[PDB]
Design a protein around this motif. Structure first.
Motif, PDB file in Angstrom:
ATOM      1  N   UNK A 262       0.831  -1.202   0.000  1.00  7.67           N
ATOM      2  CA  UNK A 262       0.000   0.000   0.000  1.00  7.67           C
ATOM      3  C   UNK A 262       0.866   1.253   0.000  1.00  7.67           C
ATOM      4  N   UNK A 263       1.919   1.269   0.820  1.00  4.12           N
ATOM      5  CA  UNK A 263       2.796   2.435   0.869  1.00  4.12           C
ATOM      6  C   UNK A 263       3.571   2.610  -0.431  1.00  4.12           C
ATOM      7  N   UNK A 264       3.980   1.507  -1.059  1.00  5.64           N
ATOM      8  CA  UNK A 264       4.650   1.606  -2.352  1.00  5.64           C
ATOM      9  C   UNK A 264       3.727   2.216  -3.397  1.00  5.64           C
ATOM     10  N   UNK A 265       2.469   1.771  -3.426  1.00  9.40           N
ATOM     11  CA  UNK A 265       1.494   2.349  -4.343  1.00  9.40           C
ATOM     12  C   UNK A 265       1.275   3.827  -4.052  1.00  9.40           C
ATOM     13  N   UNK A 266       1.200   4.185  -2.769  1.00 11.87           N
ATOM     14  CA  UNK A 266       1.006   5.581  -2.393  1.00 11.87           C
ATOM     15  C   UNK A 266       2.175   6.444  -2.847  1.00 11.87           C
ATOM     16  N   UNK A 267       3.405   5.958  -2.666  1.00  8.12           N
ATOM     17  CA  UNK A 267       4.573   6.714  -3.108  1.00  8.12           C
ATOM     18  C   UNK A 267       4.599   6.862  -4.622  1.00  8.12           C
ATOM     19  N   UNK A 268       4.254   5.795  -5.348  1.00  8.05           N
ATOM     20  CA  UNK A 268       4.179   5.886  -6.803  1.00  8.05           C
ATOM     21  C   UNK A 268       3.186   6.958  -7.230  1.00  8.05           C
ATOM     22  N   UNK A 269       1.985   6.937  -6.646  1.00  7.84           N
ATOM     23  CA  UNK A 269       0.968   7.918  -7.009  1.00  7.84           C
ATOM     24  C   UNK A 269       1.404   9.331  -6.646  1.00  7.84           C
ATOM     25  N   UNK A 270       2.022   9.502  -5.476  1.00  5.84           N
ATOM     26  CA  UNK A 270       2.452  10.829  -5.042  1.00  5.84           C
ATOM     27  C   UNK A 270       3.500  11.387  -5.991  1.00  5.84           C
ATOM     28  N   UNK A 271       4.471  10.560  -6.381  1.00 10.16           N
ATOM     29  CA  UNK A 271       5.515  11.057  -7.271  1.00 10.16           C
ATOM     30  C   UNK A 271       4.980  11.323  -8.670  1.00 10.16           C
ATOM     31  N   UNK A 272       4.034  10.507  -9.141  1.00  5.52           N
ATOM     32  CA  UNK A 272       3.423  10.791 -10.435  1.00  5.52           C
ATOM     33  C   UNK A 272       2.653  12.108 -10.399  1.00  5.52           C
ATOM     34  N   UNK A 273       1.933  12.362  -9.305  1.00  8.44           N
ATOM     35  CA  UNK A 273       1.207  13.621  -9.173  1.00  8.44           C
ATOM     36  C   UNK A 273       2.158  14.808  -9.080  1.00  8.44           C
ATOM     37  N   UNK A 274       3.279  14.645  -8.375  1.00 14.33           N
ATOM     38  CA  UNK A 274       4.266  15.719  -8.292  1.00 14.33           C
ATOM     39  C   UNK A 274       4.857  16.004  -9.666  1.00 14.33           C
ATOM     40  N   UNK A 275       5.148  14.953 -10.433  1.00  9.87           N
ATOM     41  CA  UNK A 275       5.642  15.151 -11.790  1.00  9.87           C
ATOM     42  C   UNK A 275       4.616  15.885 -12.641  1.00  9.87           C
ATOM     43  N   UNK A 276       3.336  15.541 -12.486  1.00  8.49           N
ATOM     44  CA  UNK A 276       2.296  16.251 -13.222  1.00  8.49           C
ATOM     45  C   UNK A 276       2.237  17.721 -12.822  1.00  8.49           C
ATOM     46  N   UNK A 277       2.378  18.011 -11.528  1.00 10.95           N
ATOM     47  CA  UNK A 277       2.330  19.396 -11.065  1.00 10.95           C
ATOM     48  C   UNK A 277       3.496  20.208 -11.613  1.00 10.95           C
ATOM     49  N   UNK A 278       4.714  19.672 -11.511  1.00  8.02           N
ATOM     50  CA  UNK A 278       5.889  20.444 -11.901  1.00  8.02           C
ATOM     51  C   UNK A 278       5.984  20.596 -13.413  1.00  8.02           C
ATOM     52  N   UNK A 279       5.744  19.519 -14.155  1.00  4.67           N
ATOM     53  CA  UNK A 279       5.918  19.495 -15.606  1.00  4.67           C
ATOM     54  C   UNK A 279       4.635  18.996 -16.251  1.00  4.67           C
ATOM     55  N   UNK A 280       3.644  19.869 -16.427  1.00  6.32           N
ATOM     56  CA  UNK A 280       2.419  19.450 -17.115  1.00  6.32           C
ATOM     57  C   UNK A 280       2.727  18.991 -18.531  1.00  6.32           C
ATOM     58  N   UNK A 281       2.085  17.904 -18.933  1.00  8.74           N
ATOM     59  CA  UNK A 281       2.356  17.300 -20.217  1.00  8.74           C
ATOM     60  C   UNK A 281       3.583  16.405 -20.185  1.00  8.74           C
ATOM     61  N   UNK A 282       3.660  15.523 -21.175  1.00 13.72           N
ATOM     62  CA  UNK A 282       4.768  14.587 -21.295  1.00 13.72           C
ATOM     63  C   UNK A 282       5.890  15.104 -22.183  1.00 13.72           C
ATOM     64  N   UNK A 283       5.727  16.274 -22.793  1.00 18.85           N
ATOM     65  CA  UNK A 283       6.653  16.769 -23.797  1.00 18.85           C
ATOM     66  C   UNK A 283       7.332  18.044 -23.320  1.00 18.85           C
ATOM     67  N   UNK A 284       8.549  18.253 -23.808  1.00 19.64           N
ATOM     68  CA  UNK A 284       9.332  19.439 -23.502  1.00 19.64           C
ATOM     69  C   UNK A 284       9.495  20.278 -24.759  1.00 19.64           C
ATOM     70  N   UNK A 285       9.613  21.586 -24.568  1.00 21.17           N
ATOM     71  CA  UNK A 285       9.676  22.536 -25.669  1.00 21.17           C
ATOM     72  C   UNK A 285      11.061  23.163 -25.712  1.00 21.17           C
ATOM     73  N   UNK A 286      11.477  23.559 -26.915  1.00 26.44           N
ATOM     74  CA  UNK A 286      12.795  24.163 -27.085  1.00 26.44           C
ATOM     75  C   UNK A 286      12.831  25.580 -26.524  1.00 26.44           C
ATOM     76  N   UNK A 287      11.817  26.383 -26.830  1.00 25.43           N
ATOM     77  CA  UNK A 287      11.753  27.764 -26.373  1.00 25.43           C
ATOM     78  C   UNK A 287      11.001  27.843 -25.053  1.00 25.43           C
ATOM     79  N   UNK A 288      11.561  28.573 -24.093  1.00 24.27           N
ATOM     80  CA  UNK A 288      10.847  28.914 -22.870  1.00 24.27           C
ATOM     81  C   UNK A 288      10.997  30.409 -22.627  1.00 24.27           C
ATOM     82  N   UNK A 289       9.875  31.080 -22.391  1.00 23.74           N
ATOM     83  CA  UNK A 289       9.857  32.514 -22.138  1.00 23.74           C
ATOM     84  C   UNK A 289       9.926  32.745 -20.636  1.00 23.74           C
TER      85      UNK A 289
END
Ligand SMILES: CCCCCCCC/C=C\CCCCCCCC(=O)O[C@@H](COC(=O)CCCCCCCCCCCCCCC)COP(=O)([O-])OCC[N+](C)(C)C
Ligand SMILES: CCCCCCCC/C=C\CCCCCCCC(=O)O[C@@H](COC(=O)CCCCCCCCCCCCCCC)COP(=O)([O-])OCC[N+](C)(C)C
Ligand SMILES: CCCCCCCC/C=C\CCCCCCCC(=O)O[C@@H](COC(=O)CCCCCCCCCCCCCCC)COP(=O)([O-])OCC[N+](C)(C)C
Ligand SMILES: CCCCCCCC/C=C\CCCCCCCC(=O)O[C@@H](COC(=O)CCCCCCCCCCCCCCC)COP(=O)([O-])OCC[N+](C)(C)C
Ligand SMILES: CCCCCCCC/C=C\CCCCCCCC(=O)O[C@@H](COC(=O)CCCCCCCCCCCCCCC)COP(=O)([O-])OCC[N+](C)(C)C
Ligand SMILES: CCCCCCCC/C=C\CCCCCCCC(=O)O[C@@H](COC(=O)CCCCCCCCCCCCCCC)COP(=O)([O-])OCC[N+](C)(C)C
Ligand SMILES: CC(C)CCC[C@@H](C)[C@H]1CC[C@H]2[C@@H]3CC=C4C[C@@H](O)CC[C@]4(C)[C@H]3CC[C@]12C
Ligand SMILES: CC(C)CCC[C@@H](C)[C@H]1CC[C@H]2[C@@H]3CC=C4C[C@@H](O)CC[C@]4(C)[C@H]3CC[C@]12C
Ligand SMILES: CC(C)CCC[C@@H](C)[C@H]1CC[C@H]2[C@@H]3CC=C4C[C@@H](O)CC[C@]4(C)[C@H]3CC[C@]12C
Ligand SMILES: CC(C)CCC[C@@H](C)[C@H]1CC[C@H]2[C@@H]3CC=C4C[C@@H](O)CC[C@]4(C)[C@H]3CC[C@]12C
Ligand SMILES: CC(C)CCC[C@@H](C)[C@H]1CC[C@H]2[C@@H]3CC=C4C[C@@H](O)CC[C@]4(C)[C@H]3CC[C@]12C
Ligand SMILES: CC(C)CCC[C@@H](C)[C@H]1CC[C@H]2[C@@H]3CC=C4C[C@@H](O)CC[C@]4(C)[C@H]3CC[C@]12C
Lengths: 196, 196, 196, 196, 196, 196
Positions: free
Chosen positions: F119-146
């Motif tokens: 259960x804790x392993x699943x919770x950590x997986x979900x938490x880190x996936x949600x953190x990744x979603x928060x910090x970097x929305x989308x799965x793709x990176x762009x060349x230009x950043x303003x």
């Protein structure tokens, strides 16, 4: 990789070393090895490149660095560690050779060899501490160094990199070396007392 | 990882080497390996990049470095170590092969092989010491080197990096090589004396 | 880590190789591996960055380097070593598989496999030596190279880094390869003679 | 570290793989691993930094490199190797788990699992070869690349680093992948024939 | 490399540590080691080079960096880890030495040694946490730092590299250290309670 | 290094995990470890240095990089892997400690511990996936950043390095994390069903 194997490897299976040279000296050696590993490349990694002077003459940086750092602290401590560990390696090889030569077909000579080894280890520790004192008086490093050596014109201001971190690690290594010296002297005294 | 295993590995289990080639030569070899490891990348790591001349012509740095350092000290010592260790490896492989071939179904030939191996090790030590003397006369390095080679115009001032540290390590490695030569000569003499 | 284990690992336990392929070829392979390790990153580490031309056009350095060094010496020797060691690995896997398949429930086929393996090893050695001759005629490298390839205007002077050290290591590796070729030919001849 | 242990580790102890998947596929896998190790950092180490364009606009180098190298060859081959080795690891874990579960208290399911694993390995090989064909048509790389992507104005000339060495290693890796595909197809056909 | 061996190695086979110091403290130590390994060179690798000030005076970058980072976080945590692990190593060596000395020919002294070791570990944890508080007040790092130290004229703006990532890893390491302190206090209290 | 030993090490010898957590979860963990190793230093090695903006103000590059990359993908995935593997390590240490404590002189508590760990392993997986979603929305990176943050004047154009390769590896790691989440949920459901 059990504890008995590591303890036997560090002891040297010489059956003549007491607790203050079989339990404590090995721990201090491990401590010095670990500190040297964690400070060899991270701190002293860019001692040459991050070291810059305030002049415009080509080649002044290299001559200034060589003038103020004849041999860097990490290399000096590595040489000290190698030379301090050499007599222990010699005693280990001697006892292994004695076991081998008695296996194909004695206490006093091994005792004298161990005593001479401890004396030489203490001598190497003292010699390297004295050399460190000669090359780098004081335990602290300064940011500004005034260098007047060819080809630098007059006196130029060179800037050391990370003087405070290097000072901290110098304090740690000198304290470890002093502890090693004290332990070696105690071991020699204890062996002499037990002999008589 | 016990001491008996390491001692057996370093000895070569040739049952013909005395204490001065089984307890001392192995220790000196370990010392040379450790010094070379701790000085190969930290000291001689930036011998090419930190090496600069006082000219503006492109390509003068590389030609000057190749003119004054035909082959760096660390690589020369590595080649010396490999060629010195080659005969010991050959003797170890020979004795292992002899044990294998006698296992599926002798002293004099092994004795002669070991003597020839020690002679070749001494010869390689002397040859590499002489080559070092030819390439780099003296034990010390200088900060300034005057180079007059194409395309550098006239004579330019190139600046070596860390001459003093390299001098210290050169002294250490040359002392170790001299000790190896003395030990090999002593081993040959002792074997000849015991044979007769 | 005893000597018998290392000797068995290097031999391939094929029970058909004589001394000149079980004691000498393995030693030469170890020598080549060690030389390649000690010269792969220290000498050829900065072959691209320290390589500069005397022009001002962007992108001339890369095209000149690719023109004069289609594949660097270290990578060529690494490929040669891998392809030379491939047949020995194949024979070792074959004999291991034969032992496994006979364990769950022959000499002539193994003998022919070993002979074919030695022939292929000799062929790979000769092919790589010929390729080295084609790409880099002569055993020596020069400091100046005149390059006339787009986009470099007219002919530009590029400067190789450490030509003399690379020449020394080229001589060592070519001598080792020649010794390997001679030993493989001797092994094939000896096996053919003993068969008849 | 004997040959039987390495052979058992590479085989996967699945007792269903013939010689063409237990003696040859493992050798090709070792060959690919070794080539990738010796070419990952030496050749493709400076693919980004040594890559320069002939413009003055900031940020054109990075966008051009990403335009022409969506994913470098070494990373693509590493991903291919990992995904190709995944089914073999799955089969090894399956057989180990089966041995464990039968130890605390079958041939057909293991046979089907191995066949499906070989099919998936072949599928991954083909998919990665097709992806390589899509991204980098042809087996050869060119020195000049014309890039017209924002922010680079009009079309700029970017210069790849070491196109010929990368071409050589691409040829080697593609040949190894083709050999793997052929061996996997042969293994599937042989298993199907022996089943019927 | 089984789990029992690793558990015995981490426990120290002192037969006096409960579950909260044999199952949990070892896990937290492994966690700290892994975090330090994955953040030592990637995050804090370029803390000196990527650190730049907004001035033109030579040598201001180095003095500013030394002023604001007397000893970097990674080295401080490495020293903390070494000093925290030293008493555990001492207890392991003590118990190994006791087993050796009783093998060639006790509970209370070992119990007292373990209690003193836990007390010293807690003391070192608290001392290093207090030192971290003194050097770097707060858990967060800022991008702008205003430095007014010789030779920088007046006050200059220096820019730290990756403040947010370093803040995240600081939070992780401080949380791990706090957990270690709590576990050590709990272990001491439990041992005292069980003694009485 | 046999397959049974590796399988036992990865399983944790908890005698309560089914095939979907003993054969598949370990394989996915190995896959994630290998991908992280082959992408940690080659792709994200120069994310800071190759990252440049189109301004002339000093210190804008560092603040822009910290603004757009609070914590790089590789470090985030390393932290996720460590925290996900922590409960498995805890269960392994618990079962080893239980075996040790029963050796010097139970099923339900181990079953509950394993369920809580999953259960804790699943919770950590979900938490880190949600953190990744928060910090970097989308799965793709762009060349230009303003970027418009002090000290950068107005809005500046920063250029990310290798957006497409990082996008590919992000897709791989996110797919692996999703597979881990699905497998953990399946394991929890299967254990609950078998309990009732
Ligand atoms: C040239 C560079 C030198 C650097 C400085 C070195 C300084 C010093 C550093 C290191 C020296 C070694 C430290 C660890 C020693 C542990 C020994 C041990 O526990 O032995 C035991 C276990 O032994 C084993 O079963 C194997 C243990 C492997 C030890 C490491 C091997 C090499 C690691 C390579 C690392 C690569 C990276 C290293 C860095 C590049 C003995 O076995 P046993 O089962 O007890 O025996 C039978 C039991 N009975 C006796 C009761 C009957
Ligand atoms: C290509 C580059 C080459 C570089 C130059 C190398 C120069 C030389 C350097 C190194 C050579 C080896 C040095 C250590 C040798 C110890 C041997 C030993 O003690 O054996 C013993 C223990 O053996 C074991 O149980 C395992 C010991 C592992 C040794 C290290 C393995 C590889 C390390 C990889 C390091 C990676 C990093 C290395 C650097 C990159 C033998 O076992 P035993 O239990 O005694 O046997 C039965 C007992 N009985 C006989 C009484 C019945
Ligand atoms: C992908 C990169 C590839 C690079 C090229 C590689 C080229 C080749 C290089 C290396 C290949 C291996 C060289 C050493 C082989 C020694 C074998 C040996 O002595 O076995 C013996 C000892 O064995 C042991 O007890 C353990 C020995 C450990 C060997 C090293 C392990 C991995 C080192 C990792 C190094 C990491 C760093 C490496 C560099 C990054 C066998 O055991 P035994 O007790 O004799 O058996 C029973 C006795 N009886 C049979 C009589 C009944
Ligand atoms: C995450 C990074 C992954 C990278 C990709 C990896 C790809 C793959 C690479 C490597 C995988 C392993 C390759 C060698 C396997 C040899 C196995 C073997 O011979 O086993 C045998 C010997 O075993 C021993 O006695 C010990 C052998 C040590 C093998 C190496 C250990 C780790 C090396 C660390 C290297 C560090 C550097 C690595 C590079 C950084 C089994 O023992 P035995 O005596 O036969 O058993 C009893 C005998 N009986 C069965 C007949 C009864
Ligand atoms: C100076 C730098 C220091 C860095 C910080 C170090 C921090 C700490 C890190 C590491 C410390 C060691 C961690 C692993 C310990 C596992 C022990 C184990 O399982 O033992 C068991 C297996 O043992 C074996 O058979 C061999 C296991 C080899 C362990 C690694 C050897 C050196 C690796 C070198 C790595 C090189 C790279 C490292 C990074 C450069 C014991 O054997 P057994 O069969 O159980 O015994 C008989 C069974 N019976 C008892 C029931 C009768
Ligand atoms: C701090 C950094 C951490 C990084 C993340 C680590 C993540 C994880 C990575 C690695 C964890 C270990 C992976 C391999 C485990 C294999 C275990 C195995 O097969 O055991 C078996 C073989 O065991 C042996 O005989 C020795 C095997 C040596 C394993 C490697 C030792 C250290 C390598 C150092 C590498 C240095 C370089 C690493 C990279 C720097 C057990 O022995 P057995 O004969 O089966 O026992 C008796 C048989 N019986 C039980 C049936 C009676
Ligand atoms: C009382 C204290 C000082 C004891 C310290 C023991 C020291 C000197 C011994 C113990 C184990 C030894 C190591 C064991 C094995 C090797 C591998 C060999 O290829 C080079 C030497 C090296 C690396 C040895 C160096 C010396 C060594 C570290
Ligand atoms: C008397 C003195 C000189 C003895 C010294 C012994 C030397 C020559 C022997 C002892 C152990 C040997 C090593 C044992 C195992 C290996 C691994 C192999 O893959 C490459 C060679 C290498 C690295 C050997 C090199 C030569 C070696 C270091
Ligand atoms: C007669 C001479 C040429 C024999 C030389 C034997 C060579 C070809 C054999 C002996 C031991 C072998 C190694 C043994 C184990 C491994 C680990 C594996 O994961 C990759 C291959 C690798 C690294 C092998 C490469 C080939 C090898 C070096
Ligand atoms: C027929 C061919 C394809 C078989 C190839 C076998 C491959 C897939 C197997 C054999 C041995 C395996 C390795 C054995 C041990 C480890 C250590 C572990 O911590 C990570 C995975 C890793 C590194 C395995 C990766 C997969 C591996 C290399
Ligand atoms: C309860 C917790 C804190 C226990 C932690 C145990 C720690 C302190 C022990 C367990 C195993 C030990 C290691 C075992 C072997 C070696 C090799 C030696 O050449 C240097 C020290 C070193 C690297 C030891 C350092 C200390 C160590 C990591
Ligand atoms: C079901 C899946 C998730 C199981 C995964 C098992 C993981 C969590 C276990 C298996 C083997 C373990 C490793 C075994 C040995 C060591 C050496 C030690 O000094 C540091 C921890 C480290 C590196 C362990 C980390 C955690 C580890 C990798």
């Amino acid at each position: 990789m059990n504890w008995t194997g590591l303890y036997t490897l560090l002891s040297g299976v010489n059956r003549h070393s007491t607790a203050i040279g079989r339990v404590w000296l090995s721990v201090i050696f491990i401590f010095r090895i670990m500190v040297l590993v964690v400070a060899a490349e991270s701190v002293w990694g860019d001692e040459k490149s991050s070291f810059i002077c305030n002049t415009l003459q080509p080649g002044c940086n290299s001559v200034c660095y060589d003038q103020f750092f004849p041999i860097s602290h990490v290399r000096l401590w590595s040489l000290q560690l190698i030379l301090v560990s050499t007599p222990a390696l010699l005693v280990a090889m001697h006892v292994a050779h004695q076991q081998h030569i008695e296996k194909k077909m004695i206490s006093g000579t091994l005792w004298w060899t161990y005593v001479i080894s401890v004396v030489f280890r203490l001598l190497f520790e003292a010699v390297f501490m004295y050399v460190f004192y000669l090359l780098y008086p004081g335990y602290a490093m300064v940011r500004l160094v005034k260098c007047d050596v060819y080809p630098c014109p007059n006196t130029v201001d060179c800037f050391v990199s990370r003087p405070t971190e290097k000072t901290v690690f110098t304090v740690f290594m000198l304290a470890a070396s002093g502890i090693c010296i004290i332990l070696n002297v105690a071991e020699v005294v204890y062996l002499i007392i037990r002999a008589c």
